[PDB]
Design a protein around this ligand. Sequence first.
Ligand SMILES: N=C(N)c1cccc(C(=O)N[C@@H](C(=O)N2CCC(C(=O)c3ccccc3)CC2)c2ccccc2)c1
Ligand SMILES: [Ca+2]
Length: 223
Amino acid sequence: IVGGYTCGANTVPYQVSLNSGYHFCGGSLINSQWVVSAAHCYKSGIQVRLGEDNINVVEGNEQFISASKSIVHPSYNSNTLNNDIMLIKLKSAASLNSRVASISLPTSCASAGTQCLISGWGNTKSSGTSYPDVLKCLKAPILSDSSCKSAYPGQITSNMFCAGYLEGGKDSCQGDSGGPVVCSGKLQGIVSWGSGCAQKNKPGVYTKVCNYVSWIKQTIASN
Ligand SMILES: N=C(N)c1cccc(C(=O)N[C@@H](C(=O)N2CCC(C(=O)c3ccccc3)CC2)c2ccccc2)c1
Ligand SMILES: [Ca+2]
């Protein structure tokens, strides 16, 4: 996250870290056994870390659970990032409390101008690199689809939305990928991609989770 703030320990309790000997992506807990993340975060041997604040110190509240299954949407296209969504099943159910909790899925799509919360342990710089120990947060609005498409001509599908500041200065970034965009208590986006981070007229682009609710529910039902 570039230009955001320290969330505070366990204030975003659905936020997980995907680890492969190091933090590589975020994810969102949607029930005790399943996490939503980006398909471009796929890899074998994922370890899901729930209840994290500082990802480098065991502080208490952590739960480390191996992924038993990592399911990339079947129409995911790595060239375009269309359908950039992945479902991870945990080997054992996480224990849910106030520091580890699920985030509800949307019952409808969100509208342009709605304010959302985006978080992660990704790069905090727009130039160069700096990775934080503690979870960072950023409040950002959903942009209109016309402004989204003018910023990224021919690259925005109906399964994507832009959010952030046309700005420069405040955005998600590498390392935050797969992580949540939560708006009025619903998981409406997945950190997916953008040109650089926090650059003027290049806002973040997020998977549009309201288009995948039936797919998530059927995939979970079958697995
Ligand atoms: N800012 C966000 N909100 C955000 C969030 C999460 C990751 C990234 C991210 O990693 N940004 C890349 C970048 O410049 N690129 C451009 C094109 C994109 C791509 O190849 C593509 C492919 C198909 C369709 C659309 C885009 C791949 C990343 C990058 C490279 C070097 C330093 C910083 C950032 C950005
Ligand atoms: Ca920790």
